[PDB]
Design an enzyme around this catalytic site. Structure first.
Site, PDB file in Angstrom:
ATOM      1  CG  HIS A   1      -6.337  -4.151   7.389  1.00 58.48           C
ATOM      2  ND1 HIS A   1      -6.675  -5.070   6.409  1.00 58.48           N
ATOM      3  CD2 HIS A   1      -7.497  -3.518   7.722  1.00 58.48           C
ATOM      4  CE1 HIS A   1      -7.966  -4.967   6.134  1.00 58.48           C
ATOM      5  NE2 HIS A   1      -8.488  -4.036   6.921  1.00 58.48           N
ATOM      6  CG  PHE A   2      -5.759   0.705   2.673  1.00 52.25           C
ATOM      7  CD1 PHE A   2      -6.982   0.789   2.011  1.00 52.25           C
ATOM      8  CD2 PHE A   2      -4.992   1.838   2.793  1.00 52.25           C
ATOM      9  CE1 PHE A   2      -7.406   2.003   1.460  1.00 52.25           C
ATOM     10  CE2 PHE A   2      -5.418   3.055   2.239  1.00 52.25           C
ATOM     11  CZ  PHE A   2      -6.620   3.124   1.560  1.00 52.25           C
ATOM     12  CG  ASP A   3     -11.039  -1.193   7.572  1.00 48.89           C
ATOM     13  OD1 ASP A   3     -10.880  -2.422   7.564  1.00 48.89           O
ATOM     14  OD2 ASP A   3     -12.092  -0.654   7.950  1.00 48.89           O
TER      15      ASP A   3
ATOM     16  CG  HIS B   1      -1.841  -1.126   1.356  1.00 47.14           C
ATOM     17  ND1 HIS B   1      -2.854  -1.431   0.477  1.00 47.14           N
ATOM     18  CD2 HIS B   1      -1.860  -2.093   2.306  1.00 47.14           C
ATOM     19  CE1 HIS B   1      -3.464  -2.535   0.884  1.00 47.14           C
ATOM     20  NE2 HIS B   1      -2.885  -2.951   1.993  1.00 47.14           N
TER      21      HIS B   1
ATOM     22  CE  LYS C   1      -4.882  -7.241  -1.673  1.00 50.39           C
ATOM     23  NZ  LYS C   1      -4.232  -6.126  -0.927  1.00 50.39           N
TER      24      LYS C   1
END
Length: 124
Positions: free
Chosen positions: A119-121, A12, A41
């Site tokens: 984590h990219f939410d 990211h 992905k």
């Protein structure tokens, strides 16, 4: 021995550029950041800001994560991001992605000592 943090940076962070240079950004980088290794992905977001700036989001607006955990944080200001969504087809191992650029608030889950994004939410 790949850390949660390093995986987050890899999946990211693209401090390199200030935005998605072309419309072949996603195709190129999903490949180079190992996001097309075992499958295509389906979606990924990249963030065009300093690692310090993204890291500082861990002490910005605390919000609920999509999963119900409480360790998510929303960026006070908008950031340059790039959304990669897989085109209808696109078949592995030739993964093909729509490259969308915007300026949006990011939401990340942070963990650890030190407390960093893992984590990219979401983006909003």
């Amino acid at each position: 021995k790949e850390t949660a943090a390093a995986k987050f940076e890899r999946q990211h962070m693209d401090s390199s550029t200030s935005a998605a240079s072309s419309s072949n950004y996603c195709n190129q980088m999903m490949k180079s950041r190992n996001l097309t290794k075992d499958r295509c992905k389906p979606v990924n977001t990249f963030v065009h800001e300093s690692l310090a700036d993204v890291q500082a989001v861990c002490s910005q607006k605390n919000v609920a994560c999509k999963n119900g955990q409480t360790n998510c944080y929303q960026s006070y200001s908008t950031m340059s991001i790039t959304d990669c969504r897989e085109t209808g087809s696109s078949k592995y191992p030739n993964c093909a992605y729509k490259t969308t650029q915007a300026n949006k608030h990011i939401i990340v889950a942070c963990e650890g000592n030190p407390y960093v994004p893992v984590h990219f939410d979401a983006s909003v």
